[PDB]
């Protein structure tokens, strides 16, 4: 499979612009990752400003972002684990658990944008 | 210290171009190449004009630029590079406007002080010639610089004539004089 | 003499995936979407409050017929 890469061309406070290459603009409400040396930072696609440029919302601390870091697509929306393995554990919005009780294993992953 | 300011309304691209080429002499060539690219846009009107649309791409604008320069190798030097910037800046649509403005700056460097002799009907040539001479035999033009001159037809005026150039004008026509006669006799 | 025809034949058929099934009498391109509004270039005959249909299958309606965009 191929990845979709993009450049971060504007960090305006807490909103991040990605300039992509052609035929790789993700649809609305599709997550994006960017690998800081601290952790991974999640972004959510909100608008298409034209010119293959997509304006996104942060999901964690948008400090430290150099311009032009290469964001990686993840195709679908933000995924959370479901099922009866999530019980009794503390999950944030991106799904990465923070009770320090290991990762959450489950057969399914789900989007947080359904009809 | 460049001549004839563009100032504001997108002639600054031309301004940059002018001053960047002013220090490297080659302006007439630049001007000629602008004439040639404007003509080869005009002499290929389907998608030479109608492919100056904002909805294309970054890449397709760049390849139109490449398609445009494919017709002629070594397009001057500076005006082939400026297009790339504009292609990347996507200000291509407001482009022949830049051609006209660079033309204005260029023929200002020549000193062609374009004028006008407005009327409500076109006139003989003898009047044209005598006025052009007068305008050339004038303070206005300091000589060493030319003097175009265009008669235009204006129905909104009732006749007469008005001379125009260097944001300096004289109107001895009919409409304004009727106006003034009326105003003074309408008390 | 031949290369103007070559440049025109390239240019009309480099964007032939864009310049055909086209010419904006009843088609357009989605220039910029966001917040449930798409500004679409083209559509040179569309009436105000006329139902457009997209290619992905969701319908829309046009309100601000503007010069450069719809």
**For residues A43 and A71, is the Cβ–Cβ distance under 8 A?**
yes
* B126: helix, strand or coil: helix
**Rg over CA atoms, chain A:** 15
Q: How far apart are CA B160 and CA B177, in angstroms?
A: 10
Q: How far apart are CA A94 and CA B180, in angstroms?
A: 78
Nearest to B149 by CA among B177, B115, B172, B120: B115
Q: Which two tokens stand for residue B178?
A: 């009727």
Side by side, the strands of the sheet bearing B116-118 are: B116-118, B162-165, B168-171
- Distance from CA of residue A67 to its chain's centroid? 17
CB atoms within 10 A of CB B124: 8
Nearest Cβ partner of A46 from C31, C32, C34?
A: C34
Residue by residue, what is the 3-state secondary structure of A60-87? CCCCCCCCCCEEEECCCCCEEECCCCCC
Torsion, Cα of A45, A47, A50, A53 (10° steps): -30
Residue by residue, what is the 3-state secondary structure of C42-68? ECCCCCCCCEEECCCCCEEECCCCCCC
Closest alpha carbon within chain B to A51? B57
How many domains does chain C divide into?
1
CB pairs under 8 A between B and C: 42
Q: How far apart are CA A51 and CA B143, in angstroms?
A: 50
A47 touching C, CB under 8 A?
A: yes
Q: How far apart are CA A67 and CA B70, in angstroms?
A: 35
Q: Which residues of B touch C31 (CB under 8 A)?
A: 54-55
Residue C3 lies in a domain: no
- Fill in the DSSP letter of residue A104: P
Residue C10 lies in a domain: no
- Backbone torsions φ then ψ of A110, nearest 5 degrees: -135, 150
Q: Which residues of B touch C19 (CB under 8 A)?
A: 47, 51
Q: How far apart are CA C5 and CA C36, in angstroms?
A: 44
**For residues B78 and B31, is the Cβ–Cβ distance under 8 A?**
no
| Domain containing residue C25: CATH number | 2.40.30.20
**For residues A46 and A55, is the Cβ–Cβ distance under 8 A?**
yes
**For residues B161 and B118, is the Cβ–Cβ distance under 8 A?**
yes
Closest alpha carbon within chain C to B40? C4
A2 touching B, CB under 8 A?
A: no
Q: How far apart are CA A43 and CA A46, in angstroms?
A: 9
* B4: helix, strand or coil: coil
Q: How far apart are CA A43 and CA A74, in angstroms?
A: 10
Chains that touch C (3 or more CB pairs under 8 A): A, B
Residues 6 or more apart in contact with residue A54 via CB below 8 angstroms? A6, A17, A18, A20, A25, A26, A45, A47, A48
Q: Which residues of C touch B47 (CB under 8 A)?
A: 11-12, 15, 19
Residues 6 or more apart in contact with residue B85 via CB below 8 angstroms? none
C32 touching A, CB under 8 A?
A: yes
Interchain contact, C34 vs A48, CB within 8 Å: yes
- Distance from CA of residue B120 to its chain's centroid? 23
B89 touching A, CB under 8 A?
A: no
According to the entry, how was the structure determined?
A: cryo-EM
Interchain contact, B46 vs C12, CB within 8 Å: yes
CB atoms within 10 A of CB B57: 16
Q: How far apart are CA B34 and CA B20, in angstroms?
A: 15
- Fill in the DSSP letter of residue B60: H
Q: Which residues of B touch C68 (CB under 8 A)?
A: 54
Closest alpha carbon within chain B to C16? B47
Output b/e per residue, A68-95; b: 16+ Cβ within 10 A: ebebebbeebbbbbeeeeeeeeeeeebb
The domain in which residue A59 lies consists of: 1-77
Q: Which two tokens stand for residue A9?
A: 């061309």
B33 vs B23, B120, C54, CA distance in Å?
18, 37, 43
Closest alpha carbon within chain B to C41? B55
* B7: helix, strand or coil: coil
**For residues A67 and A9, is the Cβ–Cβ distance under 8 A?**
yes
The domain in which residue C44 lies consists of: 21-70
**For residues B152 and B116, is the Cβ–Cβ distance under 8 A?**
yes
**For residues A68 and A7, is the Cβ–Cβ distance under 8 A?**
yes
Name residue A58's beta-bridge partners: A43
Query: The domain at B11-110 falls in which architecture?
Result: Orthogonal Bundle (1.10)
* A33: helix, strand or coil: strand
**For residues B81 and B119, is the Cβ–Cβ distance under 8 A?**
no
Q: Which two tokens stand for residue A40?
A: 């991974």
Q: Which residues of A touch C33 (CB under 8 A)?
A: 28, 47-48
Q: How far apart are CA B98 and CA A48, in angstroms?
A: 29
Interchain contact, A47 vs C35, CB within 8 Å: yes
Name residue A72's beta-bridge partners: A5, A33
Q: Which residues of B touch C10 (CB under 8 A)?
A: 67, 70
Nearest to A37 by CA among A66, A4, A59, A68: A66
Name residue A43's beta-bridge partners: A32, A58
Burial class (CB in 10 A: 0-12, 13-18, 19+), B96: middle
Q: Which two tokens stand for residue C54?
A: 């997209």
Please give the span between the terminal C-alpha atoms of chain A, in angstroms, as a whole number: 28
Resolution limit, Å: 3.8
Q: Which residues of B touch C3 (CB under 8 A)?
A: 70-71
Q: What is the DSSP string of B90-122?
A: T--SS-HHHHHHHHHHHHHHHT----EEEBSS-
Output b/e per residue, B77-95; b: 16+ Cβ within 10 A: ebbbebbeebbeeeebeeb
| Domain containing residue A25: CATH number | 2.40.10.170
Closest alpha carbon within chain A to C39? A50
Output b/e per residue, B155-177; b: 16+ Cβ within 10 A: eebeebbbbbbeeeeeeebeeee
Q: Which two tokens stand for residue B127?
A: 């009047």
A55 vs A23, B117, B183, CA distance in Å?
17, 54, 61
Q: How far apart are CA B79 and CA B72, in angstroms?
A: 13
Give, in degrees to the nearest 5, the angle at Cα B107 between B103 and B112. 140
Q: How far is C49 from chain B (nearest CA, A)?
A: 23
CB atoms within 10 A of CB A12: 9
Q: How far apart are CA C70 and CA C67, in angstroms?
A: 8
Give, in degrees to the nearest 5, the angle at Cα C69 between C65 and C70. 40
Closest alpha carbon within chain A to B90? A51
């Amino acid at each position: 499979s191929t990845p979709i890469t993009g450049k971060v061309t504007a960090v305006i406070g807490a909103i991040v612009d990605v300039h992509f290459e052609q035929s790789e603009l993700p649809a609305i409400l599709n997550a994006l990752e960017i690998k800081t040396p601290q952790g991974k930072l999640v972004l959510e696609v909100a608008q298409h400003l034209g010119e293959n440029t997509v304006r996104t919302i942060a999901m964690d601390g948008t400090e430290g972002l150099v311009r032009g870091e290469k964001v990686l697509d993840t195709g679908g929306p933000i995924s959370v684990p479901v099922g009866r393995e999530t019980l009794g554990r503390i999950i944030n919005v991106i799904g990465e658990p923070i009770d320090e009780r290991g990762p959450i294993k489950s057969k399914l992953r789900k989007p947080i944008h359904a009809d | 210290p460049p001549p004839v300011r563009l100032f504001g309304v997108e002639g600054t691209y031309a301004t940059a171009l002018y001053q960047a080429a002013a220090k490297n002499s080659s302006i007439d060539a630049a001007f000629q190449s602008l004439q040639k690219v404007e003509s080869t846009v005009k002499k290929n009107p389907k998608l030479g004009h109608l492919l100056l649309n904002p909805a294309l791409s970054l890449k397709d604008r760049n390849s139109v630029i490449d398609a445009i320069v494919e017709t002629h190798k070594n397009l001057d030097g500076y005006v082939v590079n400026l297009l790339k910037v504009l292609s990347e800046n996507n200000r291509l649509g407001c482009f022949e406007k830049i051609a006209s403005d660079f033309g204005v700056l260029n023929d200002a460097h020549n000193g062609l002080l374009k004028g006008t002799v407005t009327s409500a009907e076109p006139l003989d040539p003898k009047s044209f010639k005598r006025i052009e001479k007068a305008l050339s035999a004038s303070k206005l033009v300091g000589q060493g610089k030319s003097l175009k001159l265009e008669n235009v037809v204006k129905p909104e005026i009732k006749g007469g004539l008005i001379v125009e150039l260097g944001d300096k004008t004289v109107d001895l026509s009919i409409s304004t004089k009727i106006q003034k006669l009326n105003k003074v006799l309408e008390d | 003499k031949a290369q103007p025809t070559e440049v025109s034949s390239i240019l009309e058929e480099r964007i032939k995936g864009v310049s055909d099934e086209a010419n904006l009498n009843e088609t357009g391109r989605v220039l910029a979407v966001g917040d449930g509004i798409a500004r679409v270039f083209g559509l040179n005959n569309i009436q105000a409050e006329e139902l457009v249909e997209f290619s992905s299958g969701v319908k829309g309606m046009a309100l601000n017929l503007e010069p450069g965009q719809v």
